[PDB]
Write a protein that binds this ligand. Structure first.
Ligand SMILES: Cc1nn(C)cc1[C@H]1CC[C@@H](CO)N1c1ncnc2[nH]ccc12
Length: 167
């Protein structure tokens, strides 16, 4: 039993809700919140911009030190950093950004990072400003993640379509 509330159950391990991931994290304080990161950990917009703003830019400060030490992530890769006031940890995961021409096949690799964590709050990778088809992202999520994932979808219209079209 966990404290996630109001989710629709899609499969044995995948759950979905129309929610603002910032507000969900603040309420639940999950062990792991997933960020829709880029390889530079520049949290300027999209989910990343919103999560960072909610930390009063502390996420960005920590991220800049991470990059200065380690260099950029790989597309499809991840790193674990602090969750600040939102979660114990933040798993920064880089899905391909179609608006950069990045291989959508890397979306499965991106979701594989979730399997290193027993329970996560997460957005649909490569959705929103990363330009991928959110229906496809949900399919890859369900077919790749085996741990318990609670998916937050900001846009109410898109959520209804993901549910209604889910196979
Ligand atoms: C814009 C945007 N850019 N990216 C990378 C994702 C999004 C939006 C669109 C689709 C949805 C994916 O779950 N997503 C969010 N979902 C939940 N909380 C959120 N807070 C802020 C954004 C957001």
């Amino acid at each position: 039993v966990n404290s996630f509330s109001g989710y629709l159950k899609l499969t044995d391990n995948v759950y979905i809700k129309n929610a603002d991931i910032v507000e969900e994290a603040k309420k639940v304080k999950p062990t792991v919140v997933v960020n829709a990161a880029n390889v530079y950990l520049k949290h300027g917009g999209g989910v990343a911009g919103a999560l960072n703003k909610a930390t009063n830019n502390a996420m960005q400060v920590e991220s800049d030190d991470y990059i200065a030490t380690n260099g950029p992530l790989k597309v499809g890769g991840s790193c674990v950093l602090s969750g600040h006031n939102l979660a114990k940890h933040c798993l920064h995961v880089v899905g391909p950004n179609v608006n950069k021409g990045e291989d959508i096949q890397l979306l499965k690799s991106a979701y594989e990072n979730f399997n290193q964590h027993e329970v996560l709050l997460a957005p649909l990778l490569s959705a929103g400003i990363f330009g991928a088809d959110p229906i496809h992202s949900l399919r890859v999520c369900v077919d790749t993640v085996r741990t318990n994932v609670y998916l937050a979808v900001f846009d109410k219209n898109l959520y209804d379509k993901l549910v209604s079209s889910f196979l």
